[PDB]
Design a protein around this ligand. Sequence first.
Ligand code: TA1
Ligand code: GTP
Ligand code: GDP
Ligand code: MG
Lengths: 432, 440, 175
Amino acid sequence: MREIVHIQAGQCGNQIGAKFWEVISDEHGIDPTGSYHGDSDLQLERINVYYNEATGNKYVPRAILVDLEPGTMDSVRSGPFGQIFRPDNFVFGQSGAGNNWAKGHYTEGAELVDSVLDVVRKESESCDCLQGFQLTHSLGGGTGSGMGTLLISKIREEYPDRIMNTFSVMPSPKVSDTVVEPYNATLSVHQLVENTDETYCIDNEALYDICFRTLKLTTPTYGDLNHLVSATMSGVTTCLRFPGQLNADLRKLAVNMVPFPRLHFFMPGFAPLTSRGSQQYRALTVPELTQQMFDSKNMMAACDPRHGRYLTVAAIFRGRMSMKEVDEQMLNVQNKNSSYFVEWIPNNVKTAVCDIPPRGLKMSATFIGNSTAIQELFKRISEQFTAMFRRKAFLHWYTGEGMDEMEFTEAESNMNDLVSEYQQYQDATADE
Amino acid sequence: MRECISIHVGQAGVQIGNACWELYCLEHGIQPDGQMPSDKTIGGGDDSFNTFFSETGAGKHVPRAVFVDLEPTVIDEVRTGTYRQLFHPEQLITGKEDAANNYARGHYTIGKEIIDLVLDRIRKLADQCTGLQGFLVFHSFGGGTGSGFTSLLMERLSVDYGKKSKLEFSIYPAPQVSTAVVEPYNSILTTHTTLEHSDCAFMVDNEAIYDICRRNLDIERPTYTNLNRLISQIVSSITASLRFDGALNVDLTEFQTNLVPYPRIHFPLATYAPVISAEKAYHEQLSVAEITNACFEPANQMVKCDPRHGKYMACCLLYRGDVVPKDVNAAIATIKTKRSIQFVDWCPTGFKVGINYQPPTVVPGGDLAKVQRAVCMLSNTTAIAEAWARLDHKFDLMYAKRAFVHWYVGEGMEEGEFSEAREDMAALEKDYEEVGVDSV
Amino acid sequence: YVEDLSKLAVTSYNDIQDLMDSGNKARTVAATNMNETSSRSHAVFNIIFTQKRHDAETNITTEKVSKISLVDLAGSERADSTGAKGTRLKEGANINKSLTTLGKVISALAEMDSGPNKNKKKKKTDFIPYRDSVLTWLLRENLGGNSRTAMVAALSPADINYDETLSTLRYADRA
Ligand SMILES: CC(=O)O[C@H]1C(=O)[C@@]2(C)[C@H]([C@H](OC(=O)c3ccccc3)[C@]3(O)C[C@H](OC(=O)[C@H](O)[C@@H](NC(=O)c4ccccc4)c4ccccc4)C(C)=C1C3(C)C)[C@]1(OC(C)=O)CO[C@@H]1C[C@@H]2O
Ligand SMILES: Nc1nc2c(ncn2[C@@H]2O[C@H](COP(=O)(O)OP(=O)(O)OP(=O)(O)O)[C@@H](O)[C@H]2O)c(=O)[nH]1
Ligand SMILES: Nc1nc2c(ncn2[C@@H]2O[C@H](COP(=O)(O)OP(=O)(O)O)[C@@H](O)[C@H]2O)c(=O)[nH]1
Ligand SMILES: [Mg+2]
């Protein structure tokens, strides 16, 4: 029985995880107190993917909460679903990292990593057949990035055969909230490229653009961003929980999407999104979902796919629909946009179909792309990195905690090598 | 006694098996819970025929089947569905993750630790059986389980039983549409299994059946249920001769004899003629000549390959219903008269004919109309190689750069094996021409 | 480079011979059907040599520094003939991975150093996947760049091994 251990780090990861546990909990029908009050018989069939079973017919999510500032933990406990989590999994300390990756990875997090790994081992030992992990955190921050990278390294050291997923929120061109985001982002990306099987890219700029242009909201908050992201996470792993005409495990996505080991940075997307005003106009059907999934403005990474090529894509549909229509639409998308797909991967579109849609919708779809345009994002960070590293803008904070220029240099070189490895396949006309 | 054992592997195999067992239960008047009211209603005869069902003491009938899959989901659907009380509880789920579109996972690492249990169940079923005729294996290329575990199972079955026939019904990848990126690797790596161990393998294509549904049955949005029902009709037409009386009956051995000119050539195509909707069932005679001609139409082939680009080497027609030898003789003469259908120089005989009295049934809630006559044509021809060639090209496009190879190599497979499979396939492609050449 | 690598000073042939014996003892070796002493890990033996010329007027001390690198790679395996199961299988898988990437690098390198040299001289851009494995990463300067390198290929005369043996020759033909 496949099931997932869940880890949350930092403020962004903690909040996204809280919202995610509210969404999954609806689909499966779980009371905030922990009891089950569903209506369908298929909600409890595979509930063990996320939830352990307690004595009194309760269900406890298999989540791990990590931070160095206690305050966020309180915000989780004093909330709509604060009592659902078991208190033993609230692992935290004091004197947070303060947006310093060195404190998160080397000085402060090195003490709390033992306790976090203890709780992770305790959860993973009880697993019937542990599939893999998934971590939510922010690369541009402090405790989140550092402790996420450290935990990822330790877990890959101890569990080499299991899947290691990751949902990362990285910096943006215009949206910036810390002065030292490039250093943290560069070091985090250097750590992630080695020790991770899948990494979904999320950008606040793309989510705000979706909210303003697609959903037409006027005053979006972080709740809406968490809503979209949690919808994506629930969309990714639908097939482990519910039956379908053609299933798609996590390993199937990993195999079909990753041509070479270092190219595992994905662009996610979700459909439909209708703004609550145009819901009565559009007809809902497979062609509409196909059109919305591949639209450039619907992506969550703020990287235009038209500036590169799609190495691979995966489409996970939820709902009762015909397979012939899905296959025809995917073939049409391949054929019409002939110049945005690579010429040495015939039929580079993975397809999955699940028969149980979300509770309020007749149809839905999730899109996981893998394209060269992601290089742009890395290039941007690299540019900013140089602009601070050449003069050593803030390096004394990092070197005071037990680092040196050599780690910065090797991280920058690794990032540049990854950026070069994407471009290779980016240009057309492989001959000269 | 006449009987054959059905094995279903993977999601495609399990769903085709669901359709097949629905059709069999409807045909023989067996209720979903295994009881047969006809036994008490009539008090005689033989309705729970032993070709597919075994009767216990209490009157229950249990099918002779072995479902296998690495995912628990697809068979857990069966274990809690309409037919939960029919099958034996031994359903052989591997309580782990799945092959993940990898030959290596389903053949080397995870395919083992479940193969022994499957062979034990097959041994029990064979011991129950008297005068076993063969195995009907349902699987699918492209999928990791349907490829790797099929290879393991066929190897072990050939080692153990050897002389019993083994027929495949497999879903070859389509030329254009597909549901995975690593389909060509999985499909190519099954060449050794499908060539050396299988005695006669039937291939079907999703695109061809979609076109058949769109054109004939006027179904604009078909799903896999229709495909499974059509394939079930094919299999039932093939195996009908072991169950019901007929003017000319054709069992599996004599069936194989008149369809394999050489050992390395056992890859025929299959077609079902009277695929027609209920509304279009009127306005048409549906005589023997019409269905015989429709069997030879390129548009109705179940695999995307044109018979007009090659030569027919053997044909076996299996008729059901109100059919008489005069009409089939006339139809065969008319087909021989046509010049578009080219037969090889070294097979003057051409056709094998079998006739059965039991007409095809109609599943409730289905799409095929009730008909008085039907025919299934199985043709060994040279055109199939063209389809293979297309797939081979795709394989090359992914192997020149070693894309996705590390996933296979990390689970025990060696690199050169890839190359090896390709030459093996190439050798097959050279034998399915060197035979079509006119003699001198 | 490899951080915290015990670089031992030696002065005589007997001492380095003792180091060699200890190192060969310390390696990981396991028995399989193909060989009773099948190696389970790649090995790199490095000798750092320093040549000094002393003069109080003009000459420069430490005239030359050289690195002698002898590399013994675990060979590719096939699960059917090897008969591996469990750990012996998993190890082999890693070995095969560490070889497959290496082959790509060799092929990649060859084409580039064939192309720019023979084609025109464009030198636009060519990516070599050095980072896909630690073996290719550590030998970045050895397979290409700042060193003089020799490749010794081992063959098997057995007829049954033909389909494998030829493969080696092909890469050797590109080496
Ligand atoms: C159809 C209808 O009458 O109401 C819809 C609705 O109007 C729309 C606009 C909904 C609505 O979504 C939003 O307004 C929204 C706002 C900010 C961020 C994200 C969404 C909806 O709020 C969202 C809500 O979604 C669900 O109920 C899904 O099951 C969703 N779960 C949750 O939203 C949820 C939130 C908190 C607690 C429990 C469940 C889900 C989505 C993916 C995967 C799993 C679950 C639905 C259907 C609707 C409303 C209520 C208007 C849409 O959202 C989703 C995810 O369905 C917007 O795009 C769709 C299109 C829908 O038509
Ligand atoms: N005709 C038909 N084809 C199917 C059906 N289900 C799946 N397929 C085909 O099977 C291919 C791969 O699915 P499977 O071979 O069943 O994969 P699997 O057996 O579940 O093995 P895994 O890869 O480990 O999941 C797809 O490309 C489909 O085209 C079906 O119900 N009918
Ligand atoms: N999507 C989303 N992003 C957030 C949220 N809170 C913070 N962020 C992002 O995270 C970055 C700050 O990282 P932070 O959470 O402080 O890292 P930490 O200090 O290690 O916990 C900012 O650039 C924000 O864009 C949130 O609720 N939702
Ligand atoms: Mg499967």
